[PDB]
Amino acid sequence: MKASRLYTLVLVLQPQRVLLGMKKRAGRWNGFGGKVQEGETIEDGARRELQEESGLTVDALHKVGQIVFEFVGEPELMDVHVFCTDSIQGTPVESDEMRPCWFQLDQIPFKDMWPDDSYWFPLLLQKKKFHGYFKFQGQDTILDYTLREVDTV
């Protein structure tokens, strides 16, 4: 089994809207996140990436899922720990890396999101917790995947 590298993903989910960021360099909407760094907890890494990529600070996050990504031709898995929050207290800021944008929850931009999001995003919206795995060929093609609702992440 391949080694895996730790990542975070943060979704700011309010009652009628969700905050996504457009990757400027890419072209897809996503939550905010990145690699966990040495010596920080996964949750603290998620808080740090949220602040670095969107400008938003939150004191706490709720872990809602975990997704492992495998890419054909790449030696490592990406182990993505997915967090939510409903409570923010500043404005999102656009950088040269991510442009934040709010979407109403009847306008989730799936056509411009990664293909796996179509499977697990609906569980997140239902307040369900999940474990997923997706094997991609390139950016567009899923060759294999698993997804399961769990009571504990």
- Which residues make up the interface to ligand 8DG (CB under 6 A)? 7-9, 30-31, 33-35, 69, 78, 80, 114, 116-117
Q: Where are the alpha helices (DSSP H) in the chain?
A: 42-54, 117-125
Tell whether residue 31 is among the known ligand binding residues.
no
From the list Na ion, ligand 8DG, none, pick the one residue 12 interacts with, judged by a Cβ distance below 5 to 8 Å according to partner type: none
Whether 43 has a binding-site annotation, put simply, is no
Within 39-98, the residues that bind Na ion by CB under 5 A are none
Residue 53 near residue 8, CB atoms below 8 Å: no
CB of 8 to ligand 8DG, least distance (A): 5
- Residue whose CB is less far from Na ion, 107 or 150: 107
- Burial (0-12, 13-18, 19+ Cβ within 10 Å), 143: exposed
Contact 33, 10 (CB under 8 A): yes
CA dist 146 and 56 (Å) reads 32
Q: How far is the CB of 88 from ligand 8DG (least distance, A)?
A: 18
Residue positions forming the annotated binding site for 8-oxo-dGMP = 8, 23, 30, 114-117
